């Protein structure tokens, strides 16, 4: 699935 990836990408900040 892409749900975990979707969440990680929405939460990521550098």
């Amino acid at each position, epitope marked *: 699935d892409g*749900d975990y990836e979707e969440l*990680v990408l929405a*939460l990521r*900040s*550098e």
Partner: antibody
Amino acid sequence: EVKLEESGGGLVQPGGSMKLSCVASRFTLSKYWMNWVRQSPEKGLEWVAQIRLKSDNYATHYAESVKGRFTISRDDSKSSVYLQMNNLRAEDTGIYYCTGEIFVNWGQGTLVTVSA
Amino acid sequence: DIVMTQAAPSVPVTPGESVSISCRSSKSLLHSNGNTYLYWFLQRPGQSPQLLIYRMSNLASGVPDRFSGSGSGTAFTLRISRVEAEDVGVYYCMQHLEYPFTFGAGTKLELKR
């Protein structure tokens, strides 16, 4: 379901070396930052190290108590993250977990005992 | 560094009643983003920690809706509306605003009888 699995722990001499491994299944490791977190009854949960992606030039960050002795690395093609621990101290004893970027996924942990 | 304080080392509850678990940070966990960089975990005995809440108030996927998280910059609260036996273990807060990421000492939930 995603699964993280740590290995390489055990009993080790103070001043000695030990390399831990973490292998990911059903998880595209290459897309995510990885972390090592350890646990002891003395210090509780302690964040140890983090490794970012290839496009982040594999940027690393470490806890101060571990800086200069521990090295975190990844090998995306082996679906793995590692923790090379050198000049080990009694304080380094405990359960070592690897986790993914958002702390949803944790392995079962590997026990590291530093003693003479 | 960013110090996470959980004043209660333990908290007792009668099954089916509610509980609040407090955490505090030595600096605001609010990012210019508008998000609060705080996680809540449950560590059931003999198990690995499990995520309950991300960004101070969001339920992680598959966590029961009896859990909630709230707070204001430096003071945070995890709440369970009705405690069940599967809720016993150690509750930890964690900040990820700055390096090093830091955890509170933990609050263990105990059932009254």
